[PDB]
Structure 1
Amino acid sequence: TVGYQPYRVVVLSFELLHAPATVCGPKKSTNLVKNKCVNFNFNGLTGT
């Protein structure tokens, strides 16, 4: 019992190009559709 009382702190540092890309955000995927021309970016395949 603000500026003097304890505050926890966590600092993040991401590396790059030393090792293959491994840690990163999720894959926001949705539903698919049948029998209609769809523009779909299929886990890296961007075809229509």
Structure 2
Amino acid sequence: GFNCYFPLQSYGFQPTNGVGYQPYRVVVLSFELLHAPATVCGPKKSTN
């Protein structure tokens, strides 16, 4: 309609497209402070 368009859209992704237009895989690892007992933790090394 007038001044009306679909809020969703798709951009054509091509290997020969510009590097700025090239898609990148992005992952965000959101963390949070120690307000409770910790469950997910980094490995703890052990000596012989």
TM-score scaled by length of structure 1: 0.49
Give the structure with the higher percent strand.
Answer: 1
TM-score scaled by length of structure 2: 0.49
Larger radius of gyration: 2
